[PDB]
Each structure stands twice: as structure tokens, then as C-alpha cells.
Amino acid sequence: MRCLALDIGGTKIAAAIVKNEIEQRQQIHTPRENVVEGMHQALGKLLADYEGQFDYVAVASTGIINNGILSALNPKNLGGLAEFPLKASIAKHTDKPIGLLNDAQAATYAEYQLQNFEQVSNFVFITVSTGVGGGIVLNQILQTGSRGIAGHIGHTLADPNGAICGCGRRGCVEAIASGRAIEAVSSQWEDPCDPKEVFERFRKNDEKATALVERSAKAIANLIADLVISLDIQKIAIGGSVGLAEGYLSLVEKYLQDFPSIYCCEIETAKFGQDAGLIGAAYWVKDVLL
Amino acid sequence: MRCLALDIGGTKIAAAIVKNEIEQRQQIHTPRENVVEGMHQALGKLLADYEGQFDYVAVASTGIINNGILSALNPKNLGGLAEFPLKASIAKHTDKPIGLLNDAQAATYAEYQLQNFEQVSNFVFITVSTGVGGGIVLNQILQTGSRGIAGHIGHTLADPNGAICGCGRRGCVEAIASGRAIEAVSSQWEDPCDPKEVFERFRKNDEKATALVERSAKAIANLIADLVISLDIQKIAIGGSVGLAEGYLSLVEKYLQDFPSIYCCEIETAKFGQDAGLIGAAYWVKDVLL
């Protein structure tokens, strides 16, 4: 009835109790150097700050999540960490059941619970956050796949002539549209800035920042097209701090109406924010303990 | 128990009885001019050549198939035909039940019946034929989607700087890897030839034909990668006359091993050939009459 939720990410490693709402939120510095020891200690402190306060642990986590292990498809999103015994480290601190699930899959399970269930049977949530991640609901069932890969739509093809992605594959969507991909360009400018800063020189109509935010949305627009015509998607919410940025969804919708109408789809802002992973894992774990 | 199967395509409009094997095959000229009248008359003749010989009709057909209508996503694959009352025209000639299904979805349902069902739960068949088509089995269930679009993987993104596709979208996989896409290049040569001819100047190591068959496989290789990492696919058979061409699958497998191993997948030749659509529709219709 009472859940300890963790949203492990590249930037955000959240934690919260989910009674039926979020409460007692925390938000640690997801470590970017000495990360193997750093994540053991963070999982230790957070597990201590809540002992006896929960009946199960629900972990939404960046990376492929499979038999308790976190395999980082893109190690650049984890300070270099290729792998991590996620469930084990957590079990060193509590006896309660522990469910684990990719972070984007957890959000898509959250956002899907706000949808008219027989108007919308195929659904996709797209986070444009640190990287680019997704989860795929088909016939109301969240897809995870036999290895927990299903949903890793940020490493589908964006441009066969584009940047090498941190995963080793050329031209991924993540390598072109992600917060990381934006920052790789905006740091090397004569007038450097971080992603949030790119979004405001964008609104002031700086050529450079607009060309860069457009490159990202046009790629996300193409991702949605691929999704619509491959799986017959009926609605797409997009989350993440770049996705939820102001004026971005409009730029996606704009680039999406260059496509034959058949590729179009209803797109909405994620209605759960930085708390979609927590809430998703909390409900998704609970519903596969029944 | 006795089925009249039709495989409607861009080049091939087949027909056959499926008792439990194919028999009495036919193979008409899929008309490329005056096609609306042409397809009514072909559906008339074939329905007459078999009256009383079947208990139901099963139609595998190129195009989105939805409430009896064939909507051509790419009208160039149908001699211009944007739409066709497929089921209606067939009902003008028999009282028996009539099931309809996209052609690539029908093949993927065939080929999937030859698979170890709990070694392989996510499966994809890719036809590299006139165009590029697919069907997606997830958790042993063939995906069609609420509008029969699911599987139209030939109109996912291949190159955002490539040819406009006959569907209206820039850079589709079909526009780069299909038999049509090959022929559009090999006709305009100083020494023109058809696709089959491209595959033999290829084997004799003609620069031009190799550059062209490589462009197609490298794109199919990228499609498989997208499929593996999006949906956690476990095996992929590829059919169609370009797919089944000799030395092509090897070129796909070759370009696929440039990818991080996580993107790799077991790939096999389709083991049903020009009869996968017929057999697929025949079994798939029968199993959704129970």
C-alpha cells in the first residue's frame, strides 16, 4: 500500500514515497565521476531515510533493466558506467519486494493510465531528456520484451550521416535530439551555454539556437512518424525536460504537419512531469505483484 | 477446410486453393494501366475459376486493409490506384466468408508458424519486393492495429536527405531499398537494366550495380537494427524477390555486424517464397473464424 519509488537517471536520481500521491520527494546529484561507489552510497542513504515506511521498492531506471542488472545501452548517460547490480545493491538494505523497470517504460505506464482505454489502445511516451527514451503500449499492455529492450526508440535511426551515438551506432535519434546532443553543440560555440540557455536564445530568435532546437524537433517529428506507421499509434505524450520545454512541442507538431496526414498523431504534453517515472514504477510494480 | 487464397500485389496478383497445401496456382499480370476496371475483371475471372471449390476467401493484399477497403499508402505501387473496394468486389461473386489482411502481415503470420514458439516470441518478416513491407508478431500475436497500419515498416525513415517516397514522405526505406527504388536508378544508366539484371552485374562485380545493391542492404540492415532495439525482436525472416535474391541476405548480415552486438538478430531466408501471402492469409483468416 506504501511504496518507495526511485527514478534513477543520468542527471536525476529521484526518490519518493507513493501512498497514492508523491510525498517526501528527494533529488540527489546523479554522480558523474566515481559512479560505481557513488551509486552504492546513494542507494544506501535513501534506503535508510525511509526504512519501515514502505512495503515494496519500485525502481524506474535509465538503461536496459534485466534480471536486476542495469545495462547501459549508452554508457555516456551514466558517467561511464556500463553495468550496475541495481536490485542487489538495494537488497543489501531491505527485505521487501523490489521491482525494476526502464525509466521511460515507467513513465509511459503512468501517462497511459490517464487515457480513454478504448479510444487509445496503442500508446507511446517519448522522453526527450538527458537522452531520448520511450515506452510502447500496444493493446493496453506495456511492452518490455524478453530482455527489457522494447521502447529504446532513442537509438533508432535519425540520420545515416550523423554523429556517432554513445551506444556505438551511427546516426541515432538520441545523438541529434537529446539534451546531450544539444549541449555538445552549444558548449563549443564562441558564446557557450547549457541546454536551458539554448531554449531562451531560441525564443529571442538567435539563429544558432533556433537551428539547433529545430534539428532536435524535426528528428523527434520523424520518430513519431516512424512510430505511427509501424505500430498504428493513436496518442503520444512526450515528457523529459527538453520535451516539456516551452515552445518545443509546438515545433514538433509543426514539423509533423509536413508529413502526409496518415503519419499524424495526437500529441500531448506529459501530464506527470519529473514524477512520471516514480509514479509509473510504483503502479507498474504493484500491478505485477497480483 | 478448403480456402481460396489471393495474394494481391504490385507485380504479382496470385491465386490458389489451400487445402492444407497450395494447389491450382495462378499468377495474373497485376494491371498497371486502367487498373480499377482491370482489378474488377481479374477478381471476377479468378472467382469464377474456383466456384464451389472453397469454403472461404482469404486475401493477402498490398496496402492498408481496413473494413474491406484497400488504401494504398504508396499509390505508385498500384498503378496509381489510391483506393479499392476489395471485399465488395469479391462479394459480387460468392456468398462465402471473406477475410482480408495486408500482404506482408500475411507472410509474417505464415513464417511465424515455423518458429519455436517459446524461443521466439517477438518476430518480424520483412519483404523487400516491389516496395518494402513488414509484419510484427509480439508475444506470438500478429499485430495489425486498429487501422491495419501496424507493420508498414517500409515507410519508416531511412535517410532524411534521400528521395521523396511515393507516399509523400521524404527518405523512406522503400524509396532507397525496394525493387522500385533500385529500378529507378538502373533504368537511367547509360546501359539500362531491370532489378534482376542489377543482381547479376552485381555478382560480376560491376561497380554501379554493387553500389546500388549495397545502398539497399545497408538500409535494410538499419531497419532491422531499429526493429531489434525498439521492440526486442528475436528473429527476422526476410522474403520478397529482392530479399530472396542470391547474395543479398549475406550483404544484410554483413552490414548488420557493423552494429553494436545488441542490435544484432538472427536472420533467415523466408521459407515459403512467393506462397507466403497465400498461406498466411489462408491460415490467419481461418484462425479468426473460430
Ligand SMILES: Nc1ncnc2c1ncn2[C@@H]1O[C@H](COP(=O)(O)OP(=O)(O)O)[C@@H](O)[C@H]1O
Ligand atoms: N528546464 C529545462 N529546460 C530545458 N532543458 C532542460 C531543462 N532542465 C533540464 N534540461 C536539460 O534536459 C536534460 C535532463 O533531462 P531530465 O529529465 O531532467 O533528466 P533525467 O534524464 O535524469 O530524467 C539535460 O540535458 C538538461 O540540460
Ligand SMILES: Nc1ncnc2c1ncn2[C@@H]1O[C@H](COP(=O)(O)OP(=O)(O)O)[C@@H](O)[C@H]1O
Ligand atoms: N528473381 C528476381 N531477382 C531479383 N529481383 C527480382 C526478381 N524477381 C522480381 N524481382 C524484382 O522484385 C520486385 C517484385 O517483387 P515480388 O515479390 O515478385 O512482387 P510483389 O510485390 O507483388 O509481391 C520487382 O521489382 C522485381 O524487379
Ligand SMILES: CC(=O)N[C@H]1[C@@H](O)[C@H](O)[C@@H](COP(=O)(O)O)O[C@@H]1O
Ligand atoms: C543508460 C541508457 O542507455 N539509457 C537509455 C534508455 O534506457 C533511457 O530510458 C533513455 C532515457 O533515460 P534518461 O535520459 O536518463 O531519462 O536514455 C538512454 O537512451
Ligand SMILES: CC(=O)N[C@H]1[C@@H](O)[C@H](O)[C@@H](COP(=O)(O)O)O[C@@H]1O
Ligand atoms: C499499396 C501500398 O502502399 N503497399 C505498402 C504495403 O502495405 C505493402 O505491404 C508493401 C509490400 O507490398 P508488395 O511490394 O506489393 O509485396 O508495399 C507498400 O509499402
Ligand SMILES: [Zn+2]
Ligand atoms: Zn545509440
Ligand SMILES: [Zn+2]
Ligand atoms: Zn513512404
